[PDB]
Enzyme design. Structure first.
Site, PDB file in Angstrom:
ATOM      1  N   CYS A   1       0.803  -1.221   0.000  1.00 21.38           N
ATOM      2  CA  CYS A   1       0.000   0.000   0.000  1.00 21.38           C
ATOM      3  C   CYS A   1       0.842   1.280   0.000  1.00 21.38           C
ATOM      4  O   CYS A   1       1.874   1.396   0.701  1.00 21.38           O
ATOM      5  CB  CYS A   1      -0.967   0.020   1.192  1.00 21.38           C
ATOM      6  SG  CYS A   1      -1.932  -1.500   1.386  1.00 21.38           S
ATOM      7  N   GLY A   2       0.376   2.271  -0.746  1.00 17.80           N
ATOM      8  CA  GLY A   2       0.878   3.643  -0.571  1.00 17.80           C
ATOM      9  C   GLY A   2      -0.217   4.586  -0.103  1.00 17.80           C
ATOM     10  O   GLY A   2      -1.386   4.223  -0.085  1.00 17.80           O
TER      11      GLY A   2
END
Length: 183
Positions: A166-167
């Site tokens: 995830c970002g």
């Protein structure tokens, strides 16, 4: 040791360590790419899941080994992958290491980039028709890198490893690191 692990869970495949990070975990393969988002290594349900390799990876054959991990900002799982967005951290930290059936393999990171999750899902490839498409795929991953890794000599003979987590810079961001097998 690796046997013990294989016992505690038969979905186990290999250990992974990412230079520059506290990433140093066993990695499991599920029948899909959802189970291990929501279940730990004892399979007990869990918010933080486990590190898993793509459930359609053939680890013996495939040119790209794809491994997924949570980033929940709390220094667990793939959280610290975020540091590779830093140019200096990237320059200084280079190697990912897999240990599998008694055997150590090392990969040098050549690409880091961020991308929308759906976009990414349709781009990432484990399977390849032929050498030209593989080569084309390799040049695209390299060309997307936020930073150049000097003297990497990327070509269609190489085998790669791709790490995805995830970002948080935009909605559904994913961060991606790609590495080439060396030695």
């Amino acid at each position: 040791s690796e046997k013990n692990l294989k016992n505690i869970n038969p979905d186990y495949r290999f250990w992974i360590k990412v230079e520059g990070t506290n990433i140093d975990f066993p990695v499991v393969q599920g029948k899909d790419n959802d189970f291990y988002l929501h279940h730990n290594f004892n399979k007990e349900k869990s918010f933080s899941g486990s590190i898993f390799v793509d459930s359609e990876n053939n680890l013996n054959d495939d040119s790209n080994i794809v491994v997924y991990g949570h980033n929940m900002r709390n220094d667990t799982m793939f959280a610290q992958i975020k540091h590779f967005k830093n140019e200096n951290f990237f320059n200084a930290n280079k190697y990912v290491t897999l240990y599998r059936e008694g055997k150590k393999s090392t990969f040098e990171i050549f690409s880091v980039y961020q991308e929308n999750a759906k976009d990414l899902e349709s781009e990432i490839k484990t399977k390849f028709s032929n050498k030209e498409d593989y080569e084309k795929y390799l040049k695209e991953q390299e060309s997307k890198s936020l930073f150049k890794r000097d003297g990497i000599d990327l070509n269609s003979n190489d085998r790669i490893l791709t790490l995805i987590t995830c970002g948080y810079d935009f909605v559904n961001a994913r961060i991606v690191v790609v590495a080439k097998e060396i030695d």
